[PDB]
């Protein structure tokens, strides 16, 4: 899937392009209706940012001309423009690189962002990642109603966390609990063990429960002291 | 309690040699009269053949039908019994086991399971069963060598599935079935591993 997918959309790349807009949600549908470079929104990090990409001329328009009535944009650095009626006329390729797959049952709950419910491992296959290719994910709306059903750990798994904002911006408004914790893996100014150990502690010091005997494969448990009591003066005439 | 471990099991062809091992762990080996006892389908136990420890002698006794066939050694120095099988028969594909004690058949090890084969190894055949009587499946025939996987729908339906042990014929290659059972889409996926092939074949219902 991930090579093949690579070097389907190398071919594209190089042609249109993307850049991440805050200033609302069908707001933004109706400033760029007048253009047909769009069929959908391509993601929504939350409800109040979105992402359009699109064909070069089109998303320069839009880009010099909301630039004087709002929320600044941001051009994303992307050779190619997904999410976009621009992948359809390149379906074939794509169905005969992976028309070959065997979907096994999934152990955990993998919770879709393209169908917006929780699938089954036997439901993927060429179709399910090019609708995933193709149409949007709704990535808010998912750690929304996520964080209603009883998860209160959304731990973060990548070189550099960039959707913490959006992640806190979206179960800050559900009716859940709100000191659900959310923790990255890296950072940009670290990749060694210390920092992935300071992540860890920091999921661990608000409720998960973290085995602390893999780090110290070679040590002995030492002598230690006790806990230290804070005593009052508790005394009934005897 | 203590252990018997085993080894040497495989494929044969007939009429030639092959030679198991069997070391003990626990106890003195230089003491123990050991016993050795065949196992094939279709049949119970069979006692073949025993060897007399040492500070007895070195007599060894066979069974009939194997007298001038089998041979049994041991080394208590290294502490091995052995059995040296010249000139096999297609009859005896069979797990052994090596029993402690001459007459007190007391302990029993784990076994391995040797067989002699005729027939070279060759992909199955999957034929769809069409009820003509609700039940529906699928045979595998003429495979080799064990053993084979039956799945249904990928590993989605696995209740009323009924699996069959793959009884040998009269020919040397291996066939069962595989029904399940559904009121009233349907396909079994059969996959023979040292062959490398998987079939995905539908069944009518």
């Known amino acids: 899937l991930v090579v093949g997918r690579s070097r389907l959309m190398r071919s594209l790349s190089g042609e249109g392009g993307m850049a991440a807009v805050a200033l609302g949600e069908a707001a933004v549908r109706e400033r760029l209706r007048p253009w047909q470079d769009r069929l959908s929104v391509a993601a929504v990090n939350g409800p109040r940012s979105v992402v359009v990409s699109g064909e070069p001329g089109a998303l320069r328009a839009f880009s010099e001309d909301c630039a004087a009535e709002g929320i600044r944009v941001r051009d994303i650095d992307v050779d190619y423009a997904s999410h976009s009626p621009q992948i359809e006329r390149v379906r074939e390729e794509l169905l005969e690189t992976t028309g070959d797959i065997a979907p096994r049952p999934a152990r955990v709950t993998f919770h879709s962002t393209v169908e917006s419910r929780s699938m089954d491992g036997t439901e993927l296959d060429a179709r399910y990642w090019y609708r995933n290719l193709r149409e949007t994910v709704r990535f808010a709306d998912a750690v929304t109603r996520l964080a209603e059903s009883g998860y209160d750990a959304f731990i973060e798994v990548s070189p550099h966390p960039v959707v913490v904002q959006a992640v806190e911006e979206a179960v800050e408004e559900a009716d859940g609990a709100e000191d659900a914790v959310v923790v990255g893996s890296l950072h940009r100014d670290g990749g060694d063990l210390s920092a992935f150990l300071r992540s860890m502690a920091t999921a661990h010091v608000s409720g998960v429960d973290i085995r602390w005997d893999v780090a110290l494969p070679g040590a002995a448990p030492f002598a230690l002291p006790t806990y230290p009591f804070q005593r009052k003066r508790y005394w009934l005439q005897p | 309690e203590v252990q018997l471990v085993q080894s040497g099991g495989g494929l044969v062809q007939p009429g030639r040699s092959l030679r198991l091992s069997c070391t003990a762990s626990?106890?003195?080996?230089?003491?123990?009269?050991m016993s050795w006892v065949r196992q094939a389908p279709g049949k119970g136990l069979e006692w073949v053949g025993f060897?007399?420890?040492?500070?007895?002698?070195?007599?060894?006794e066979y069974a009939a039908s194997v007298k001038g066939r089998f041979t049994i050694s041991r080394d208590d120095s290294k502490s091995i019994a052995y059995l040296q099988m010249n000139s096999l028969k297609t009859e005896d594909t069979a797990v052994y086991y090596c029993?402690?004690?001459?007459?007190?058949?007391?302990?029993w090890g784990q076994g391995t399971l040797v067989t002699v084969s005729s027939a070279s190894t060759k992909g199955p055949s999957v034929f769809p069963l069409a009820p003509s009587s609700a039940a529906l499946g699928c045979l595998v025939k003429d495979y080799f060598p064990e053993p084979v996987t039956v799945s249904w729908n990928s590993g989605a339906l696995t209740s009323g599935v009924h699996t069959f042990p793959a009884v040998l014929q009269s020919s040397g290659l291996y066939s069962l079935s595989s029904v399940v059972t559904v009121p009233s889409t349907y396909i079994c996926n059969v996959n023979h591993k040292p062959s490398n092939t998987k079939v995905d074949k539908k069944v009518e219902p």
């Open positions: 626990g106890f003195t080996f230089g003491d123990y009269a």
């Open positions: 029993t402690r004690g001459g007459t007190l058949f007391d302990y």
């Open positions: 060897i007399r420890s040492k500070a007895y002698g070195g007599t060894t």
